[PDB]
Amino acid sequence: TDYTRIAASALGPEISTEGMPLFSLIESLELTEAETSRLPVIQDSMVIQK
Amino acid sequence: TDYTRIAASALGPEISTEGMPLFSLIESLELTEAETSRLPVIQDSMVIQK
Protein backbone atom coordinates (compact mmCIF):
# COMPACT_ATOMS: atom_id res chain seq x y z
CA THR A 1 0.00 0.00 0.00
CA ASP A 2 2.82 2.47 0.72
CA TYR A 3 4.50 4.47 -2.03
CA THR A 4 6.28 7.79 -2.51
CA ARG A 5 4.52 10.63 -4.28
CA ILE A 6 4.58 14.39 -4.76
CA ALA A 7 1.96 16.05 -2.57
CA ALA A 8 -1.06 17.66 -4.23
CA SER A 9 -0.39 21.36 -4.79
CA ALA A 10 -2.70 24.15 -5.97
CA LEU A 11 -1.42 24.02 -9.57
CA GLY A 12 -1.28 20.30 -10.35
CA PRO A 13 -2.80 16.90 -9.60
CA GLU A 14 -1.11 13.90 -7.96
CA ILE A 15 2.38 13.05 -9.27
CA SER A 16 3.87 9.57 -8.94
CA THR A 17 7.69 9.91 -9.16
CA GLU A 18 7.82 6.38 -7.80
CA GLY A 19 11.22 4.94 -8.71
CA MET A 20 14.35 5.64 -10.74
CA PRO A 21 13.97 9.44 -10.69
CA LEU A 22 13.93 11.16 -14.08
CA PHE A 23 16.82 13.44 -13.08
CA SER A 24 19.30 10.54 -13.08
CA LEU A 25 18.57 9.82 -16.75
CA ILE A 26 20.55 12.83 -17.98
CA GLU A 27 23.86 11.56 -16.60
CA SER A 28 23.50 7.87 -17.47
CA LEU A 29 21.93 8.35 -20.92
CA GLU A 30 23.73 11.56 -22.05
CA LEU A 31 20.69 13.26 -23.65
CA THR A 32 20.99 16.29 -25.88
CA GLU A 33 19.31 19.60 -25.10
CA ALA A 34 16.33 18.58 -27.25
CA GLU A 35 15.55 15.44 -25.25
CA THR A 36 16.21 17.26 -21.97
CA SER A 37 13.31 19.67 -22.55
CA ARG A 38 10.95 16.70 -22.90
CA LEU A 39 11.58 15.48 -19.34
CA PRO A 40 9.22 17.98 -17.62
CA VAL A 41 6.51 17.13 -20.16
CA ILE A 42 6.62 13.43 -19.28
CA GLN A 43 6.91 14.31 -15.59
CA ASP A 44 3.37 15.72 -15.55
CA SER A 45 1.85 12.75 -17.40
CA MET A 46 2.37 10.46 -14.38
CA VAL A 47 -1.07 10.79 -12.83
CA ILE A 48 -2.62 8.18 -10.54
CA GLN A 49 -5.88 6.53 -11.58
CA LYS A 50 -8.47 5.34 -9.06
CA THR B 1 37.22 31.52 -30.29
CA ASP B 2 36.25 31.88 -26.61
CA TYR B 3 33.00 33.54 -25.55
CA THR B 4 30.57 33.50 -22.64
CA ARG B 5 27.48 31.31 -22.84
CA ILE B 6 24.63 30.03 -20.68
CA ALA B 7 24.95 26.25 -20.64
CA ALA B 8 22.39 24.34 -22.71
CA SER B 9 19.89 23.10 -20.14
CA ALA B 10 17.28 20.36 -20.59
CA LEU B 11 14.57 22.86 -21.59
CA GLY B 12 16.40 25.42 -23.73
CA PRO B 13 19.09 25.84 -26.38
CA GLU B 14 22.33 27.81 -26.15
CA ILE B 15 21.93 31.39 -24.92
CA SER B 16 24.50 34.03 -25.82
CA THR B 17 24.49 36.72 -23.07
CA GLU B 18 27.79 37.90 -24.50
CA GLY B 19 28.22 41.47 -23.29
CA MET B 20 26.35 44.32 -21.60
CA PRO B 21 23.89 42.14 -19.66
CA LEU B 22 20.22 43.04 -19.96
CA PHE B 23 19.67 43.61 -16.23
CA SER B 24 22.02 46.61 -16.31
CA LEU B 25 19.54 48.38 -18.61
CA ILE B 26 17.09 48.96 -15.75
CA GLU B 27 19.43 51.33 -13.93
CA SER B 28 20.67 53.17 -17.04
CA LEU B 29 17.34 53.50 -18.88
CA GLU B 30 14.57 53.78 -16.24
CA LEU B 31 12.25 51.46 -18.13
CA THR B 32 8.64 51.09 -17.00
CA GLU B 33 6.81 47.83 -16.26
CA ALA B 34 5.72 47.39 -19.89
CA GLU B 35 9.39 47.06 -20.89
CA THR B 36 10.86 45.12 -17.97
CA SER B 37 8.50 42.27 -18.91
CA ARG B 38 9.96 42.11 -22.42
CA LEU B 39 13.52 41.51 -21.19
CA PRO B 40 13.19 37.73 -20.63
CA VAL B 41 11.59 37.35 -24.07
CA ILE B 42 14.51 38.95 -25.89
CA GLN B 43 16.88 37.08 -23.58
CA ASP B 44 15.59 33.79 -25.01
CA SER B 45 15.89 35.03 -28.61
CA MET B 46 19.71 35.05 -28.56
CA VAL B 47 20.22 31.63 -30.10
CA ILE B 48 23.62 30.74 -31.55
CA GLN B 49 23.80 30.06 -35.28
CA LYS B 50 26.06 27.43 -36.83
For chain A, give the secondary structure using H, E and C: CCCCCECCCCCCCCECCCCCCCCHHHHHHCCCHHHHHHHHHHHCCCCCCC
Helical residues (DSSP H) of chain B, grouped into ranges? 24-29, 33-36, 38-43
The type of residue at B41 is V
CA of A7 vs chain B CAs: smallest distance (Å): 24
Which one of A29, A35, A36 would you mutate to disrupt binding with B, by most B Cβ within 10 Å of its Cβ? A36
Task: Say how far apart CA B8 and CA A34 lie, in whole Å.
Answer: 10
Q: Which residue of B lies nearest to A26 if distances are taken between CA atoms?
A: B10
Name the DSSP letter for residue B22: T
Q: How far apart are CA B49 and CA B2, in angstroms?
A: 15
- Nearest residue on chain A to B9, alpha-carbon basis: A33
**Cβ neighbours of residue B14 closer than 8 Å, sequence gap 6 or more:** A33, B5, B6, B8, B47, B48
PDB resolution in Å? 3.7
Q: What was the experiment behind these coordinates?
A: cryo-EM
Output phi, psi for A41, to 5 deg. Answer: -65, -45
Task: Specify the DSSP class assigned to residue B20.
Answer: S
> Which of chain B's residues have a Cβ under 8 Å away from the Cβ of A26?
10
